[PDB]
Amino acid sequence: MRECISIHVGQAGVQIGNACWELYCLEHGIQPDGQMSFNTFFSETGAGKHVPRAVFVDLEPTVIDEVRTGTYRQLFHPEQLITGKEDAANNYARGHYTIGKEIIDLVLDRIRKLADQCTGLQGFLVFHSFGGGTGSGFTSLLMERLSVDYGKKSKLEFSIYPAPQVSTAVVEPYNSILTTHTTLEHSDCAFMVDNEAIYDICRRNLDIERPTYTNLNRLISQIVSSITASLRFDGALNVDLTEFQTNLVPYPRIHFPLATYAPVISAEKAYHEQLSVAEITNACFEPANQMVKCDPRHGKYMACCLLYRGDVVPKDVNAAIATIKTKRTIQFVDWCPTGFKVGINYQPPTVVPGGDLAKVQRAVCMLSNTTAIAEAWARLDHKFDLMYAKRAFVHWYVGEGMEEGEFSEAREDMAALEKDYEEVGV
Amino acid sequence: MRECISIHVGQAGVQIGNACWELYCLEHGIQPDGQMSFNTFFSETGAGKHVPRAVFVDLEPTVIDEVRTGTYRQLFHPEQLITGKEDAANNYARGHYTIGKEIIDLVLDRIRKLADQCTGLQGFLVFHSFGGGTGSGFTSLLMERLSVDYGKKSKLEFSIYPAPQVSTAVVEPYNSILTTHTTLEHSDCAFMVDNEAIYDICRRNLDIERPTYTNLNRLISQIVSSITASLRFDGALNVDLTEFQTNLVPYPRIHFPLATYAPVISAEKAYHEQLSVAEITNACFEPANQMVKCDPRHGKYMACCLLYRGDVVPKDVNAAIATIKTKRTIQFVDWCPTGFKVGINYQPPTVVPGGDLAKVQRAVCMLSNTTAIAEAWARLDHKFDLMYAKRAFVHWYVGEGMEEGEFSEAREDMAALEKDYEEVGV
Amino acid sequence: MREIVHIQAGQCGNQIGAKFWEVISDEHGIDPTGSYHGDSDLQLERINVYYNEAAGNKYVPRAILVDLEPGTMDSVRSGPFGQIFRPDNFVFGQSGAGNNWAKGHYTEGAELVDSVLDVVRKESESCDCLQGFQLTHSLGGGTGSGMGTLLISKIREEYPDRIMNTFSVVPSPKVSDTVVEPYNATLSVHQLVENTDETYCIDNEALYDICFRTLKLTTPTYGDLNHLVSATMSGVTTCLRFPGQLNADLRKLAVNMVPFPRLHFFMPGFAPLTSRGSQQYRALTVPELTQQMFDAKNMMAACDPRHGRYLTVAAVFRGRMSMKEVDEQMLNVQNKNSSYFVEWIPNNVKTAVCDIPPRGLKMSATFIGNSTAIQELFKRISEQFTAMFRRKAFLHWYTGEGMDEMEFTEAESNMNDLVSEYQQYQ
Amino acid sequence: MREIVHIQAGQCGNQIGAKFWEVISDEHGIDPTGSYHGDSDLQLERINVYYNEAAGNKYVPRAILVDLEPGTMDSVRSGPFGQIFRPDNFVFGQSGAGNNWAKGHYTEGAELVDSVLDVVRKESESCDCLQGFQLTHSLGGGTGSGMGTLLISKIREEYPDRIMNTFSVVPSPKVSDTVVEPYNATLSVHQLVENTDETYCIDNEALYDICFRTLKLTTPTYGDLNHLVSATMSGVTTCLRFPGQLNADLRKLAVNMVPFPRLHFFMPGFAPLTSRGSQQYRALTVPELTQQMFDAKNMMAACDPRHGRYLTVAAVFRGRMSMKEVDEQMLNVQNKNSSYFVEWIPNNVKTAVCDIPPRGLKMSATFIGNSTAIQELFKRISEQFTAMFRRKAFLHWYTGEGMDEMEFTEAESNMNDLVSEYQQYQ
Ligand SMILES: C=C1C[C@@H]2CCCC(=O)C/C(C)=C\C=C\C(=O)O[C@H]([C@H](O)NC(=O)/C=C\C=C\C)C/C(C)=C/[C@H](C1)O2
Ligand SMILES: C=C1C[C@@H]2CCCC(=O)C/C(C)=C\C=C\C(=O)O[C@H]([C@H](O)NC(=O)/C=C\C=C\C)C/C(C)=C/[C@H](C1)O2
Ligand SMILES: Nc1nc2c(ncn2[C@@H]2O[C@H](COP(=O)(O)OP(=O)(O)OP(=O)(O)O)[C@@H](O)[C@H]2O)c(=O)[nH]1
Ligand SMILES: Nc1nc2c(ncn2[C@@H]2O[C@H](COP(=O)(O)OP(=O)(O)OP(=O)(O)O)[C@@H](O)[C@H]2O)c(=O)[nH]1
Ligand SMILES: Nc1nc2c(ncn2[C@@H]2O[C@H](COP(=O)(O)OP(=O)(O)O)[C@@H](O)[C@H]2O)c(=O)[nH]1
Ligand SMILES: Nc1nc2c(ncn2[C@@H]2O[C@H](COP(=O)(O)OP(=O)(O)O)[C@@H](O)[C@H]2O)c(=O)[nH]1
Ligand SMILES: [Mg+2]
Ligand SMILES: [Mg+2]
């Protein structure tokens, strides 16, 4: 079995992971203690106790400690659950240098150990946010080490895009820039989602009153679930992660696809709806199902992917696509003529018990690169610029050893990359 | 299956719709939750839950909210039941501009979505009154959008004629003029009925003491039922809506037919009557069965239609018609030599449980264009003129952005159209 | 929902409001503790209009109590009210204006006003769609009259597109309750007319007639008089609080009843009105109910309605009844009494029907007339005022507060323009 | 774990700390004997932060009591404290500084300081990861003010990378409690500003308002005032003491709330704040909770927060709630009130949520503002100080101890630079 590595970094990465692996266990019938193709993320041990390919890193021990008390404690390896003493406190200089140093060796040795547990190592996912100290600095350090030790393997990262209007941390704009700049050279593709757009979607589609991290995370976990499903299950067109890289990265550095999922609908709405292949596919290109708050009509599509799950047949897809391509309201780049790779998986999507989504016979994860993403760039570039013009909170990094002009150069690189989006769209 | 769109606008439109779809479900054996040719108004979903082609728009949420609590809640789509916050309060300026703006996009996207649910889209009915703010302003806005997005499809509207002597709203004359003027360029045929004449008929024929919206609406719903029946069922001469347009519109703008129905009689009277084809047909041209209070002897017939339902055979019809044409007390226009299209449908009419009409083996919907309609024109033209001479309630629109002289021009157009009735009759 | 907010001003205002809010609490099955206990769903279906739920069943009346004289509210909250109302809303000082408009409005009242407005904002923030403000007042009582007027000016500035309206007790044409009551009235009116959408005009004298002679009430106290006022207020809002054949929202009613800007003065009618002894000799039909509505004896303002012409008449019915029956009956009335209706408006009637009755009266209706007759009440005040103004009677209490003679000059001048407009239309 | 250590200095410091440590003991289910009796695991999960287990259940508050005036602690340990606290920690002399900064800090206090520091070291040795030092003080009380300042200088030398912070009562802007309170403050501040990471600024006056008027407390004693202070301190640490959706460690909060080095002055906010009578009229929503947090009335420092701009605002919530609900609500606030937020920082909000409520309040939150408004408090002291400084009022008590005139000159000069920085950012 080809198997992949997962890493979870930061409160965000860990939380999402919590739900993610709960889901996986449910998708394979695995009990919370690991008790029994899943060998693509699990290692079967002597007792039928399958143990996950995942390393959890938390400098703020509280979060993993909760995981270590939580029901899936049994499942994970104590040597996988790697906790620190104090966190980076939303400081990249510590996450990527001062504090991150300590553990980063410990974690790498877990990773190498686990890599020798494996035969068919294919990719490795890294869950984190763009601004949380743990998530931010630490990730770029880690990725640089994995780009050395493995380098050939698929480097996947999930970094939650800092929602346009809505932020929790003040310096979050800083951290994103700096994190991103660094990890640009060590990451093969980076995913971004928006907590705000997702909130909007929970409300709009699922008919949710007030979203929180619990249910939001269940959503994300199902999106990831489909990606992996191409590996974990039989499908007509089985997509490997290596493929994902080939097809979703039009250009060496712009590997920053966004992804949505349909059907997102309450069990109630499912009875006033017949969700056909075409129905859903159409919904995938609705700006209101757009899980990053960036309306797709603001740019052109650089690339596409349809990870279809459940009862979906090649022609219905082909016809649905034909319909989509016919709709010329979906503008895509001259550069990229017909690139709509579709994945199709057979295995249906699955619903979490106590979950909030309609159990549907077919679903799809749409994934795309659009020039419209430059909008998101603009925002953060500017956000950062504003505070950097002040040196709001600059004392705080520059005491930690960070260089003025390093920050300027990092933002320069982000501006050059934004300028590259412009270049593609042309 | 060719299928049609229905829209319901305003309290009136929605109420009528309530009864209308109850009736339809009864005509196909469909349960209140959609549970099972009806696919010409329904979409069968996975569970046998047929869902209607209809969108309900109510700025005054109270009415649809009642529908949403009502038994046929189950049947409709939550995304079909589109409610606002506040209504236009009998103000066309808000219905067609200020407030109507908000929803009108939301509704159109339902309509486009539903239009993609469809293959054979043929017409779309719009239920409303001529003066209710929701019904009035909103309709003309909507129709203009549908005349863009579809344009080829049959545009059908039901606007209840503001009963000659009897009004509920004071400014109702305003609204009709303004609404009508606008929708003149976007509507293919507009039906008008009179609540008063209908009251008279309930009393006269059905032997009703005191009519109200409940039972009145059941009547209207059966009239519409016959029209659709030509689509929904097998008949010898099956009439498509496209036909209705071809034959009922003698002239680009005068598309304002009126329609009655016979037999309208209590179950009691049915035993002292033998309702033959000829019997009923005769009754159709009785001025006392005239569902707009406009006595047909005040003008000449511009056009005709007989939608026959139940046990009716071609010759009996032909003979009945022969009798009618022989009766030279029915004066019709030189312009239009023999135009009496008859429809005939096979499928009988149906009676509502707890209803007030005699279950008859055969029925017919008569529909006609007569020059006598100019009378109705005169009334409203004048009514409006009177109040406009005062500017009674003018502050109320003109604050909303409406133009003096716009109102004058609108009435001019209504006067030109009335002058056109005169022109035809000549 | 669409929330309405009340203000109560003066002894008069706070006393009337005392029972009004009691009455509505009955209407929705709300107990004296603010906890909803009704049985039917319609009891609380729209409860949001007048109530904010503060937990469980706590329902909070949307109302602010405002008085410079603290004993008033003290008595109200000593009664079966104080624990419905929240203490955030008791906004009161300790100084009486002593029936000085100049005080209650213009000088000291302003202090209190600021804190009032802040509470106003609180409520307007908590509201979903703010549909406006009802303010109880005595037109001649110093702080009812004055203080209300200031609040209105401010609120209308901050919510200029909302329906704001007042229930101002007009001075009894025979007996004055304040010696300067003509001053308090004329001043109030100056600002009240320009800054409100609707004002109801009511006389205690007329109420006395109704109480003692028509209802054969033995001892007509204010509790029973206010019972009558509370009455007509309740009905209006049933248009919003409940569904019906014709749901006519408060705004819609307003729109229909105001032919011209500034003439928004209403003389609530009432039905049925007969003492318990005589009720067994009559039948509540629509003809009966309307005959009651068209009685000068059932006119709650002291004005003979057959002086001049009705501009507009809103018949709002409560309970089940036939639309033909109603329509026809209203038209019978308009035909017979056609000498009392303004020729300007064809169909001088206006109607609405909510399908729930008040209290246990199978049939009920409330009659909102706007007749040119009302000018007499304006004369009453004008004339009385004028005489005192000539001699400068009690001038030094107002000029003591800094009020200009020309302020009073312009105030009467604007009541004279007002009556002049009534004449022009009469 | 990460342990925090407290110091208590002065009557003020030791009194406040008295109840603070009582409160936390409640928060973790610790009885008055220092023996843990709580039920939930979270009661003692992180107990190590503030407690050292000395056997069985003996839990030892990590705190040192320091006072030159022995009766203070004598009263504390006479109370329900003395046997929680260990006698190693009572470090006290027998001589009062008599509200002479010069004494309590600079001359005699130093004697006591040495023994204090030794106990400090004891605790810092027993700690696993020393996360810092909270020191209760009155900014104007002689030994709270002074002695604390010396301890801080020393401790910061020996633990320069730790979070050290103080709760210093700022002199009430209206009433002075010490005649030389301006001296004690200005001096303390000189050294306090440069040697601390955070300082909380609080006024007894503002607390009085909050107690008596907002909470309608009849007799506002220090027990109840300190109840409020104890409050806001508790919340901050819930970030560390408990888990949550957003765990924001004290360091992380610090990092986010300090835009510039030295401006670390905080005005704790509070929610909910309403007396028991009014609680039944409201609902604790996030909108409610935040409305409370954004109230000038709930600002515990005597400063109008709408003077100038907020640099940064940390909303720390306690209890379960939706992240959308919170985020959205905070953003609604920032949008509406955008005139009060510093343009420098896009997304002027900052948030954190711990998933445990205080005490039995389902919802609670504590608001940490840093507004340029705070400069007024600095003015208060500056101005008062200045006047006295001119005349050399009470000079011979300080110069009696050997304090230089230029010491006071430089002290005010540094408060003037401080306020100057607030202006530049305002
Ligand atoms: C808006 C409302 C609610 C209030 C409720 C107050 C009830 C109250 O506490 C006293 C009571 C229980 C009944 C009073 C009836 C009333 O005055 O009765 C009245 C009158 O005496 N009733 C009639 O004249 C009824 C029949 C007339 C037939 C010719 C009318 C009246 C003012 C009713 C109002 C209507 O009652
Ligand atoms: C950090 C904490 C812990 C302390 C605990 C002290 C408790 C004490 O001994 C007295 C008591 C049992 C309750 C006091 C409540 C309180 O003052 O209640 C306060 C206030 O009166 N409560 C509200 O305003 C609550 C609802 C407001 C709705 C608009 C707020 C308050 C200072 C709470 C603090 C929060 O209580
Ligand atoms: N989707 C999702 N986002 C989260 C969750 N928790 C935190 N975030 C986001 O993550 C960002 C904050 O970073 P965290 O992951 O909480 O912090 P951290 O990685 O532990 O880093 P430090 O504590 O600063 O060292 C914000 O953008 C939050 O919106 C979660 O449970 N789900
Ligand atoms: N046939 C029939 N006519 C109705 C019914 N209800 C209202 N009407 C008529 O509709 C007109 C009033 O307009 P409505 O439809 O009630 O008002 P609306 O469309 O909701 O518009 P606004 O409330 O003013 O925004 C009058 O001519 C009524 O006679 C009904 O149930 N059946
Ligand atoms: N309908 C009604 N009118 C009242 C009541 N109390 C006082 N009034 C009238 O209000 C006027 C006196 O004003 P008042 O409210 O007492 O003065 P204020 O306290 O200064 O606002 C007189 O015309 C009274 O007839 C009451 O309970 N009901
Ligand atoms: N909040 C609070 N403030 C206090 C208390 N006791 C004294 N103060 C304040 O502290 C200042 C007096 O300082 P104090 O602590 O008594 O002097 P010290 O013993 O020399 O440190 C005055 O501003 C008082 O208002 C208390 O119990 N609570
Ligand atoms: Mg974290
Ligand atoms: Mg309506």
Side-chain angles (χ1 to χ4, degrees), chain A residues 10-12 58-60 63 87 132-135, chain D residues 244-249 252:
Chain A
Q11 182 188 290
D58 185 16
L59 281 170
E60 177 189 7
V63 181
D87 69 44
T134 309
Chain D
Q245 303 304 287
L246 298 165
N247 292 329
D249 178 84
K252 188 161 72 168

Side-chain angles (χ1 to χ4, degrees), chain C residues 329-359:
Chain C
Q329 182 58 27
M330 296 304 297
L331 301 157
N332 296 344
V333 172
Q334 186 183 178
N335 293 340
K336 295 177 178 182
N337 292 282
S338 55
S339 57
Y340 307 115
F341 298 94
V342 170
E343 299 165 43
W344 287 130
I345 294 174
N347 193 83
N348 295 275
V349 297
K350 192 270 172 292
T351 186
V353 181
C354 286
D355 290 334
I356 187 162
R359 310 287 310 143

Side-chain angles (χ1 to χ4, degrees), chain B residues 224-244:
Chain B
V224 175
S225 166
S226 308
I227 303 165
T228 64
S230 72
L231 299 171
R232 299 180 293 116
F233 296 105
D234 299 352
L237 312 169
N238 288 316
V239 177
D240 195 280
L241 304 177
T242 304
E243 295 183 47
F244 277 126

Side-chain angles (χ1 to χ4, degrees), chain B residues 10-12 87 90 129 132-135 160 168 172 195 213 216-217, chain C residues 252:
Chain B
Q11 182 188 290
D87 69 44
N90 237 41
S129 47
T134 309
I160 295 167
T168 60
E172 194 157 22
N195 288 341
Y213 286 152
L216 179 153
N217 284 333
Chain C
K252 188 161 72 168

Side-chain angles (χ1 to χ4, degrees), chain D residues 21-315:
Chain D
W21 284 106
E22 187 194 59
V23 165
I24 297 173
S25 296
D26 290 329
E27 297 267 278
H28 295 270
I30 299 169
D31 72 2
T33 65
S35 175
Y36 164 85
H37 294 293
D39 301 335
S40 180
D41 298 355
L42 290 174
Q43 298 275 295
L44 78 172
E45 188 69 31
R46 292 296 173 266
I47 197 166
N48 297 347
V49 171
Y50 282 146
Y51 296 89
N52 194 346
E53 196 181 307
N57 303 308
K58 299 290 188 182
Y59 281 106
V60 176
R62 307 263 184 184
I64 302 169
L65 314 180
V66 189
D67 202 350
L68 283 172
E69 200 177 340
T72 311
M73 296 181 200
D74 197 53
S75 66
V76 174
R77 67 192 172 189
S78 290
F81 303 112
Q83 74 272 12
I84 306 282
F85 294 102
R86 67 182 184 185
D88 291 354
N89 292 9
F90 290 88
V91 183
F92 68 90
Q94 312 178 29
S95 172
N99 303 325
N100 301 315
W101 192 100
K103 289 186 178 290
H105 180 278
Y106 156 82
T107 63
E108 178 184 10
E111 185 183 347
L112 199 60
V113 159
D114 294 349
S115 58
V116 175
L117 286 170
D118 291 325
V119 179
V120 171
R121 289 161 188 160
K122 289 178 186 179
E123 281 294 340
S124 76
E125 175 66 21
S126 61
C127 290
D128 304 329
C129 182
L130 166 68
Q131 156 151 52
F133 294 104
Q134 311 185 282
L135 299 99
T136 327
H137 306 314
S138 54
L139 193 57
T143 56
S145 185
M147 148 202 293
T149 306
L150 187 57
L151 287 174
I152 294 159
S153 174
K154 298 291 180 180
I155 292 173
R156 187 196 47 71
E157 179 192 24
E158 293 186 359
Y159 312 94
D161 62 340
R162 260 61 189 189
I163 307 300
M164 293 182 59
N165 57 352
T166 65
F167 292 78
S168 215
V169 169
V170 304
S172 303
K174 308 175 186 176
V175 305
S176 197
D177 290 309
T178 313
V179 299
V180 297
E181 203 164 7
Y183 279 63
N184 285 347
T186 308
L187 290 174
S188 189
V189 163
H190 170 57
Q191 297 295 321
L192 182 68
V193 175
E194 302 302 326
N195 293 284
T196 57
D197 292 311
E198 300 181 352
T199 65
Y200 296 82
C201 301
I202 191 169
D203 176 8
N204 296 343
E205 184 71 52
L207 288 183
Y208 288 140
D209 280 324
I210 294 158
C211 300
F212 186 93
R213 194 194 43 73
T214 298
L215 314 185
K216 300 300 187 297
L217 188 60
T218 59
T219 43
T221 63
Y222 279 125
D224 302 307
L225 296 163
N226 297 343
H227 172 291
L228 289 162
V229 180
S230 307
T232 61
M233 300 177 61
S234 172
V236 170
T237 62
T238 62
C239 275
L240 185 56
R241 298 188 286 117
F242 296 107
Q245 303 304 287
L246 298 165
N247 292 329
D249 178 84
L250 167 63
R251 185 187 289 278
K252 188 161 72 168
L253 293 177
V255 177
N256 286 305
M257 289 188 296
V258 177
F260 185 82
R262 280 196 287 273
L263 315 174
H264 46 66
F265 293 93
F266 298 104
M267 298 181 285
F270 209 123
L273 289 177
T274 288
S275 62
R276 283 178 295 168
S278 297
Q279 287 177 18
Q280 302 306 296
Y281 299 96
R282 314 188 67 85
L284 296 169
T285 62
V286 166
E288 182 63 32
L289 190 50
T290 51
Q291 183 61 50
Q292 296 293 324
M293 293 171 86
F294 281 105
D295 199 347
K297 290 181 173 179
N298 296 335
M299 179 59 78
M300 300 170 76
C303 199
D304 175 337
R306 289 162 304 184
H307 170 295
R309 302 283 192 280
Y310 279 109
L311 296 162
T312 176
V313 175

Side-chain angles (χ1 to χ4, degrees), chain C residues 24 27-28 46 49-50 234-235 237-243 318:
Chain C
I24 297 173
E27 297 267 278
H28 295 270
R46 292 296 173 266
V49 171
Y50 282 146
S234 172
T237 62
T238 62
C239 275
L240 185 56
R241 298 188 286 117
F242 296 107
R318 301 189 59 172

